[PDB]
């Protein structure tokens, strides 16, 4: 039960007949029973900075007057 | 259209209501709004008393004065409201409790006054001690000043009495009292009462901790620190003065573990 | 494997107050539970937990002494006030991680060298 | 839907303007940070952006292993007056600075700890003495468990204590420990007191230290030299490298400005000057 | 209850969460979680101390942050006996856990030691 | 079948539980059981705090002694429980409040003891004054003895001090304290702890008044009067003694009108 | 069917009571 | 002939695009002929404490009188 995932290719080797071009994937197999023991996936999300940027109750429209 | 302005607002909880005509809207901390503990995230087993209105009402703590030579102010929750009606009672009567708030810092002046007050809300506002001889030794009596609150200072003063130390916080304003830069404090939910604009402040802070429900007497959740960003200057008067008032109201409060009354040594 | 040192100890008169310092090696509080066991021979006074609070004092001295923790310097003190001739004893400091045993002198593993304190009967 | 390795928002072409729209105008009194992108204050060309925030993801930021502690031990001669020094250390990140400061940008967290042990050794006496490859034991004593008293007492028999026997000169020792926190998240800061001073008691019995708790108590590590006494004193250092993996954090705080002093939030005097001199009207 | 058949009574066994005054009077223990017990044909009773704690798990040691509380028994009336009956008797206690009781992080005990 | 006996019973409310092996079942007064105020019969307008568990729990008032020469005892509600935890608190904190109860009078002896105690529940138990000089003049301090309760007497004693009267109730047992015949008191909800039979008493009394919600400090709803129907005799002993204990628990309690704390002159 | 890593019995909401049921009463003489 | 089994995830990595979220499984292959040599599965059962708690002949109903 392997885990094959994709890589974000950086320096593409003058190849598309193996490397660079065609999507490069990597395999990952868990060897231990504990989740702790697992490797760090790194395929983490990203969110909107709004729970910091706009902590406001009403909705902000960046073109209208802030205080009305 | 029908006059719905961001400065004109009305807050109401239980039997208390706050109105304001000069606001900068309101800040819902971290995007969360108060709610009761979810059966999912629940911890203890007993039946939870939800006082609601009885505890969920605006309480005006004592009023302080803001002059030129003021360095700052600091309040703790649920500390400050340990002497407030029912919320105060039920608190001492339990071992575990979670509570949200709605800090409504009021502070008005005139069109002729100027300056800014930074009303910050630091979750787990841990302040520093007063001596370089014994770290983490500030006593409880000074840690929970209550509704009178604690005050910031503009210079660090070490306590040299090792016979019987002071055991209090000596927070230097430019370091928020915790040794970081005040200019970065604008990461915690906050509002700036810049005289010209608005005349109040509003920050609804939900229950944050690492625990689902925790002891109130022992642990303080939110810290209210108000420091002057811009100095208070008026006309050509050497000693101007306007008062500052805060009225924090608990929200979505509940309590678990009814025991006998707690009587803490406060002095 | 901590190493204790009894410093800040000496002669004084009766009625006064004196402070005692107890710096330690390491990786100090890591062996945990610092103490203050006086007596010309062996007898406790103050006990303290490296974590939390967590004070307690010998009934014989209760309400006149205090043991404090300076985790930064790695020194444990002892503020002795309102001294009285019966306070002239051989002061030492101790430790054992075992989060308990504060009522047995031989329960310890660590000991310092000591410092003789004298409450001189002047008055 | 948005991941770490995704391309940031593409800049859109914007031209001249004269409207009833006011991007540039805000009022930080609202607490809200005005969201202004390039195509607002200036006319920008269309840019198919390529930069991604991949390396700035929570996991990536703490993706390095830090040095938490240095534990000293030795193997003195069988004839020495002193006892064979075995190390005991209270498990915490705080003892150093770096790893701590990084963990300070947040109020809370959850992370499976991964540990590394790069041990080193050396002789000490001016004797051309010999020492066979030494064996090392790293013993995890949880809170309130038998902490060793000697280098050779029943305790190390560890019928239940997870230990690590490291044979000097091999690929460093490593173990992984999940979220052992008593809470839901480990509190890097704690406003409070473990005890509450009471009124029908005494100031002594209800006195507690501010800022601490059981939260940050996990146990101690005990390290020794499993080999017996050898004709030549051989000292040894145990470096512990901790690396948080699979991490989450809650509620930001500003980084530690002034130099550290103790495990508390406390600060010493003379170290209260973080900045330097620089004119207001000079670049 | 281990007293004669002709002996009677009512007791107040109680449990109060920690972080306050340890109760030394019925009046205070009465203010907490308790189970009033009557002595009769059914010789035994059971008070259930439900889990009411700040953390998700408490330290198995003597620590304050994760302190447990106080269990106390008090007379609700008193012990009543007729003539020709022993004025003193004994009561045994039996502690156990409820189905939701769990533990974690195995370690070595201190209740035994091999010296030398 | 599975052992469901009328003497074996278990009561539970909040964090308190009473068990009994010698009961005479339980008496649900007038056939009604506690409930909260119906929107139909509602009076005030504000939001009602329903403390529930916080206030709805068994409180053991002080214990008295029953010997041969005992004439009787009397307790008022919500008086007695004016010093009881949260229920006590919330009470003083309001102007209006309704509350039900569950009086669990306990009193055990042996197979060798004999006698009977009449535990009566008189709604609006109005007792008489002590002087033939000034009617309706009993002061509040004696009217609300609280948890210590008031005691009956076996002979009327007029107060002759007109300089500074006693101003207390002088209730003669055979007249229930109100001048009627005690033998007719068996009309109010009641139970008789006739030693041989049971060893306790139980009377759930619902909220009765003329009003839907009324002031608690000022007005007392139910009166608990315990008088010896049959004298306590034991063996061939001249001075027998067994204790009497009561534990009344509020039910379906609510409060309206949150104000400042009431501090009544009790002495 | 029940394994090691399974969640323990869920606590169910319980309210006021006045019944012929006697949970609190036992008699350890039964060994049970 | 591998043995792929599931893990009880603890600290979920800000992922469901690999880790945390989607069920994490581990592979296990036996390398020796003897059962002794096998690893410890740990996926053990759990039973009712009745063979200790209620060693009684008759059936116990927790609401009725113990001794009738
Ligand atoms: C074989 C060695 C086993 C090690 C066992 C793990 C010890 C746990 C250490 C956890 C350190 C995390 C610090 C967080 C403290 C906090 O913020 O509350």
Domain boundaries of chain B, sorted by first residue: 1-267
- The Cα–Cα gap between A39 and C43 comes to 55
- The Cα–Cα gap between A44 and D4 comes to 6
Q: Residue C75 half-sphere exposure, CB side, CA atoms within 13 Å?
A: 16
Sign of torsion, CA F208 F213 F217 F218?
negative
Task: Give the H/E segment covering residue F89.
Answer: helix F85-92
Q: Residue B154 half-sphere exposure, CB side, CA atoms within 13 Å?
A: 7
Give the count of beta carbons closer than 10 Å to the beta carbon of residue D135.
13
Exposure b/e, E26-63, CB count within 10 A at least 16 = b? bbbbbbbbbbbbbbbbbbbbebebbbbbbbebbbeeeb
Assigned token pair, B62: 């004592």
In 3D, which of D104, D98, D255 has the Cα closest to residue D188? D104
Assigned token pair, B99: 């509570």
> Which residues fall within 8 angstroms of residue D15, CB to CB, at 6 or more apart?
D43
Does A40 reach chain H within 8 Å, measured CB to CB?
yes
> Which residues fall within 8 angstroms of residue H47, CB to CB, at 6 or more apart?
G2
CB H8 within 8 A of CB G5: yes
DSSP-derived letter for residue B127 is P
- The Cα–Cα gap between F226 and F105 comes to 9
Ligand 1: distance of its center to the CA of D93 in Å?
Answer: 8
How does DSSP assign F201-224, residue by residue? --EEE---SSSSS--TTT---EEE
Residue D180 CA: which ligand 1 atom is closest? 8
Q: Could you tell me where the beta strands, DSSP code E, fall in D142-262?
A: 163-167, 173-177, 220-225, 234-252
Assigned token pair, C28: 């100090």
CB D189 within 8 A of CB D164: no
- Confirm or reject: Cβ of D106 under 6 Å from ligand 1: no
CATH number for the region A1-68 comes to 4.10.80.10
CATH of the domain at D70: 2.60.120.20
Q: What is the tally of structural domains in chain D?
A: 1
- Looking at the DSSP bridge assignments, the partners of residue A6 are A25
Per the document, the length of chain E is 116
Mutational pocket test of ligand 1: of D101, D114, D177, the residue with most ligand atoms within 8 Å of the beta carbon:
D177
Assigned token pair, F212: 């839907």
> Which residues fall within 8 angstroms of residue F251, CB to CB, at 6 or more apart?
F13, F34, F56, F99, F100, F101, F102, F204, G16
- The Cα–Cα gap between C66 and F107 comes to 51
- The Cα–Cα gap between E24 and E26 comes to 7
Q: Show contacts of F143-147: CB within 8 Å, 24+ apart.
A: F143/F76, F143/F169, F144/F76, F144/F79, F144/F82, F144/F220, F144/F266, F145/F76, F145/F79, F146/F79, F146/F80, F146/F82, F146/F83, F146/F266, F147/F61, F147/F62, F147/F80, F147/F81, F147/F83, F147/F84
Peptide bond into E82 cis (omega under 30): no
CB F78 within 8 A of CB F213: no
> Which residues fall within 8 angstroms of residue F48, CB to CB, at 6 or more apart?
F36, F37, F254, F255, F256
Resolution in A: 4.6
Give the count of beta carbons closer than 10 Å to the beta carbon of residue B137.
24
Taking an 8 Å cut-off on Cβ atoms, the answer to whether E64 and C53 are in contact is: yes
Assigned token pair, B222: 């939110």
- The Cα–Cα gap between B255 and B46 comes to 10
In 3D, which of B137, B183, B180, B181 has the Cα closest to residue B158? B137
- In chain E, residues with a C-beta closer than 8 Å to the C-beta of C100 are 62
- The Cα–Cα gap between D222 and D224 comes to 7
Collapsed DSSP state (helix, strand, coil) of residue D11: strand
- In chain B, residues with a C-beta closer than 8 Å to the C-beta of C72 are 135
CB D236 within 8 A of CB D225: yes
CB C110 within 8 A of CB C98: no
Q: Kindly list the distances between the CA atom of residue D195 and the CA atoms of C53, D184, E63, in Å, as whole numbers in the listed order.
A: 7, 21, 10
CB E10 within 8 A of CB E88: no
Q: Show contacts of D39-46: CB within 8 Å, 24+ apart.
A: D39/D11, D39/D12, D39/D13, D39/D14, D40/A62, D40/D14, D43/D14, D43/D15, D43/D16, D44/D11, D44/D12, D44/D13, D44/D14, D45/D11, D45/D13, D46/D10, D46/D11, D46/D12, D46/D13
The residue behind tokens 């989740």 is A35
Mutational pocket test of ligand 1: of D99, D104, D105, D186, the residue with most ligand atoms within 8 Å of the beta carbon:
D186
CA E84 to chain centre: 31
- In chain C, residues with a C-beta closer than 8 Å to the C-beta of E65 are 52
How does DSSP assign chain C, residue by residue? ---EEEES--EEESS--EEEEEEE-SS-GGG---EEEETTTTEEEEE--SSS---EE-TTT-SSEE--EETTTTEEEEEE-S--GGG--EE-EEE-SSS---S-GGG-SEE---EE-EEE---
- The Cα–Cα gap between B51 and B57 comes to 11
Ligand 1: distance of its center to the CA of D246 in Å?
Answer: 15
Instruction: Tell me which residue range forms the domain holding D221.
Output: 1-283
- List the end-to-end C-alpha distance of chain D, in Å, as a whole number: 43
Give the count of beta carbons closer than 10 Å to the beta carbon of residue D203.
15
> Which residues fall within 8 angstroms of residue F113, CB to CB, at 6 or more apart?
E80, E82, F195, F232, F233, F234, F240, F242
Q: Architecture of domain B1-267 in CATH? A: Sandwich (2.60)
- The Cα–Cα gap between B183 and B175 comes to 9
Assigned token pair, H30: 């036996």
Does D180 reach chain E within 8 Å, measured CB to CB?
yes
CB D52 within 8 A of CB D58: no
Q: Show contacts of H20-25: CB within 8 Å, 24+ apart.
A: H20/A41, H20/D246, H24/A30, H24/A35, H24/A38, H25/A1, H25/A30
Give the count of beta carbons closer than 10 Å to the beta carbon of residue D55.
12
- Confirm or reject: Cβ of D93 under 6 Å from ligand 1: yes
Sign of torsion, CA F38 F43 F45 F46?
negative
Exposure b/e, F249-265, CB count within 10 A at least 16 = b? bbbbbbbbbbeeeeeee
Q: Residue E17 half-sphere exposure, CB side, CA atoms within 13 Å?
A: 27
- The Cα–Cα gap between E54 and B255 comes to 12
- In chain E, residues with a C-beta closer than 8 Å to the C-beta of C54 are 64
Q: Phi and psi at residue C63, in whole multiples of 5°?
A: 85, 35
The residue behind tokens 């994937």 is A25
- List the end-to-end C-alpha distance of chain H, in Å, as a whole number: 59
Residue D164 CA: which ligand 1 atom is closest? 1
Sign of torsion, CA B43 B49 B53 B56?
negative
Collapsed DSSP state (helix, strand, coil) of residue E48: coil
How does DSSP assign B77-123, residue by residue? TTTGGGSSHHHHHHHHT-SEEEEEEEE--B----TTEEEEEEEEEEE
- The Cα–Cα gap between B18 and B248 comes to 11
Give, using CA atoms, the residue closest to atom 12 of ligand 1.
D92
DSSP-derived letter for residue E47 is -
DSSP-derived letter for residue B63 is P
| Nearest CB to D261 within list C1, C72, C97 | C72
Å between H1 CA and nearest CA of chain E: 34
- Looking at the DSSP bridge assignments, the partners of residue F243 are F65
B85-92 and F85-92 helices, crossing angle to 10°: 170
DSSP-derived letter for residue B148 is G
E113 φψ region: left (φ > 0), alpha (ψ -120 to 50), beta (else): beta
Taking an 8 Å cut-off on Cβ atoms, the answer to whether B134 and C17 are in contact is: no
């Amino acid at each position: 039960g392997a885990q094959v995932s994709s890589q974000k290719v950086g320096a593409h080797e003058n190849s598309n007949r193996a490397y660079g071009g065609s999507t490069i994937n990597y395999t990952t197999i868990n060897y231990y029973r504990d989740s702790a023991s697992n490797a760090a996936s790194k395929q983490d999300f990203s969110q909107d900075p709004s729970k910091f940027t706009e902590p406001i109750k009403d909705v902000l429209i960046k073109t209208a007057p802030m205080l009305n | 259209a029908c006059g719905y302005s961001d400065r004109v607002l009305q807050l109401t909880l239980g039997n208390s209501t706050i109105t304001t005509q000069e606001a900068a809207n309101s800040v819902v901390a971290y995007g969360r709004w108060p709610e009761y503990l979810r059966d999912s995230e629940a911890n203890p087993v007993d039946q939870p008393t939800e006082p609601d209105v009885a505890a969920c009402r605006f309480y005006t703590l004592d009023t302080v004065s803001w002059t030129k030579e003021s360095r700052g102010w600091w309040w703790k929750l649920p500390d400050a409201l340990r002497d407030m009606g029912l919320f105060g009672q039920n608190m001492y009567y339990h071992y575990l409790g979670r509570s949200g708030y709605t800090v409504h810092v009021q502070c008005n002046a005139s069109k002729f006054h100027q300056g800014a007050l930074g009303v910050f809300a630091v979750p787990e506002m841990c302040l520093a001690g007063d001596s370089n001889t014994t770290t983490m030794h500030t006593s409880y009596q000074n840690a929970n000043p209550g509704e009178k609150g604690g005050t910031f200072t503009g210079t660090f003063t070490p306590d040299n009495n090792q016979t019987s130390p002071a055991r209090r916080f000596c927070p230097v304003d430019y370091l928020l009292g915790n040794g970081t830069l005040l200019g970065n404090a604008f990461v915690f939910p906050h509002q700036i009462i810049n005289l010209r604009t608005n005349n109040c402040a509003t920050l609804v802070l939900p229950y944050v901790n690492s625990l689902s429900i925790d002891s109130m007497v022992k642990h303080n959740n939110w810290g209210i620190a108000i420091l002057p960003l811009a100095p208070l200057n008026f006309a050509s008067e050497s000693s101007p003065e306007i008062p500052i008032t805060l009225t924090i109201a608990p929200m979505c409060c509940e309590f678990n573990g009814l025991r006998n009354i707690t009587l803490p040594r406060l002095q | 494997q901590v190493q204790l040192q009894e410093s800040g100890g000496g002669s004084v008169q009766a009625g006064g107050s004196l402070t005692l310092s107890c710096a330690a090696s390491g990786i100090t509080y890591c062996m945990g539970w610092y103490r203050q066991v006086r007596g010309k021979e062996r007898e406790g006074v103050a006990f303290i937990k490296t974590n939390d609070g967590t004070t307690d004092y010998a009934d014989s001295v209760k309400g006149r002494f205090t043991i404090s923790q300076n985790h930064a310097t790695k020194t444990v003190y002892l503020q002795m006030n309102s001294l009285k001739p019966e306070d002239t004893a051989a002061y030492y400091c101790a430790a054992t991680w075992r989060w308990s045993c504060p009522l047995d002198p031989e329960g310890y593993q660590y000991w310092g060298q000591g410092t003789q304190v004298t409450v001189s009967s002047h008055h | 839907a948005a991941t770490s390795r995704d391309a940031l928002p593409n800049t859109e072409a914007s031209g001249p303007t004269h409207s009833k729209e006011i991007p540039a105008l805000t009022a930080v009194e609202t607490g809200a940070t005005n969201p202004l992108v390039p195509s607002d204050t200036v006319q920008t060309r269309h840019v198919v952006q390529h930069r991604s925030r991949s390396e700035s993801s929570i996991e990536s930021f703490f993706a390095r292993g830090a040095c938490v502690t240095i534990m000293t031990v030795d193997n003195p001669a069988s004839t020495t007056n002193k006892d064979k020094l075995f190390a005991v250390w209270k498990i915490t990140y705080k003892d150093t600075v770096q790893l701590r400061r990084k963990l300070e940008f947040f109020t809370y967290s959850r992370f499976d700890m991964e540990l590394t042990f790069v041990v080193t050794a050396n002789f000490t006496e001016t004797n051309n003495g010999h020492a066979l490859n030494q064996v090392y034991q790293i013993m995890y004593v949880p809170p309130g468990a038998p902490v060793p008293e000697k280098w050779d007492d029943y305790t190390w028999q560890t019928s239940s204590n997870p230990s690590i026997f490291y044979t000097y000169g091999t690929a460093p020792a490593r173990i992984s420990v999940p979220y052992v926190g008593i809470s839901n998240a480990y509190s890097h800061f704690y406003d409070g007191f473990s005890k509450v001073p009471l009124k029908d008691q005494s100031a002594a019995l209800g006195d507690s230290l501010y800022g601490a708790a059981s939260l940050n108590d996990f146990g101690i590590l005990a390290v020794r030299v499993v080999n017996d006494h050898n004709p030549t004193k051989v000292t040894s250092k145990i470096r512990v490298y901790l690396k948080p993996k699979h991490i989450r954090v809650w509620c930001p705080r500003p980084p530690r400005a002034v130099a550290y002093y103790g495990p508390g939030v406390d600060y010493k005097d003379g170290t209260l000057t973080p900045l330097s001199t620089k004119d207001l009207t000079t670049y | 209850f281990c007293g004669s058949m002709m002996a009677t009574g009512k007791l107040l066994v109680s449990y109060a969460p920690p972080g306050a005054d340890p109760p030394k009077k019925r009046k205070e223990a009465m203010l907490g979680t308790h189970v009033i017990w009557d002595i009769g044909l059914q010789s035994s009773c059971t008070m259930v101390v439900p889990w009411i704690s700040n953390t998700t798990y408490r330290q198995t040691i003597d620590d304050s942050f994760t302190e447990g509380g106080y269990i106390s028994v008090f007379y609700q009336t008193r012990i009543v006996v007729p003539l020709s009956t022993p004025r003193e008797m004994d009561i045994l206690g039996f502690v156990s856990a409820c189905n939701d009781f769990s533990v974690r992080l195995l370690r070595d005990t201190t209740h035994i030691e091999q010296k030398a």
